[PDB]
Amino acid sequence: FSKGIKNLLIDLGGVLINLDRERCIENFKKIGFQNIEEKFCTHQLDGIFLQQEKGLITPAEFRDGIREMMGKMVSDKQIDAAWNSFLVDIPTYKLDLLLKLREKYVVYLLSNTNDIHWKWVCKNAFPYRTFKVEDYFEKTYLSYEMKMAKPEPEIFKAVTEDAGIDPKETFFIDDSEINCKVAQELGISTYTPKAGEDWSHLFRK
């Protein structure tokens, strides 16, 4: 599209699901993690946060880590609630779009995420009418299952290799410029949506 595109790799954060850093911060202060900002910066993740993203630690360990940094007992589900408040919604017109794109492309998800967040979006964002997450994607490639994260070159190679697809026939939509620049090196074509951009214009005749 015109470019012999057969496959789409779709990012999750921003591109599909709206995010809210401030709300997450506030909810974390509320439960008594007053210095949440010192320790957390999704723009440049560190420590346990980076670790969970590559699946180097379990959710249980993530929660102890959080408990330890807070110096205070706070229940698993209270921790999960604050962490999950980062995630907002996938607008249903994006789900419609993914469903429509199935007619012409094989569609994959490639996402830096973690087990807590993933379970939340599978439960709360993807279900729609009769559909679930499996309905939208041939496969979902998640950093914490792959033990790698964007923008490592190795992740884009692991995906095209695992999927049996040709990078030059693949189009990647990710709101991170660095992610896209690295994918381009492998010959993947890319588009970098702005925050809140409805990128369905990419598909118009």
Q: How far apart are CA 9 and CA 111, in angstroms?
A: 9
Nearest distance in Å: CB 180, Cl ion: 11
Question: Which of residues 31 and 45 has its CB atom nearest to Mg ion in the complex?
Answer: 45
Nearer CB in complex with Mg ion: 66/146: 146
Q: Given the rule CB under 5 A, which residues bind Cl ion? A: 13, 91-92, 112
Q: Which residue has the tokens 């970098």?
A: 192
Q: Nearest Cα to 145, choosing from 165, 135, 159, 157? A: 159
Which residue of this chain has its Cβ atom nearest to Cl ion in the complex? 112
Q: Which is nearer to Cl ion, 13 or 55 (CB)?
A: 13
Structure letter (DSSP) for residue 203: G
| Residue whose pair of structure tokens reads 């492998």 in the numeric block | 186
Work out how close the CB of 42 gets to Cl ion at its nearest, in angstroms, rounded to a whole number: 10
Binding-site residue total for Mg ion (CB under 5 A)? Answer: 4
Residues 82-101 that bind Mg ion (CB under 5 A): none
Q: Which of 8, 13, 109, 170 binds Mg ion (CB under 5 A)?
A: 13
115 has catalytic annotation: no
Find out whether 175 is annotated in a ligand binding site. yes
**Binding flag, residue 53, Mg ion (CB under 5 A):** no
Residue 112 binds which entry of Cl ion, Mg ion, none, CB below 5-8 Å type-dependent: Cl ion
Confirm if 192 and 200 have CB atoms less than 8 A apart.
no
The reply to whether 65 sits in an annotated binding site is no
CB of 2 to Cl ion, least distance (A): 27
Residue 7 phi/psi, 5-degree rounding, is -130, 145
Residue 142 burial class via C-beta count within 10 angstroms: exposed 0-12, middle 13-18, buried 19 and up: buried
Tokens describing residue 155: 């992740």
Nearest to 173 by CA among 189, 150, 160, 159: 189
Kindly list the catalytic residues: 11
Q: Which residue ranges make up the annotated binding site for Mg(2+)?
A: 11, 13, 174-175
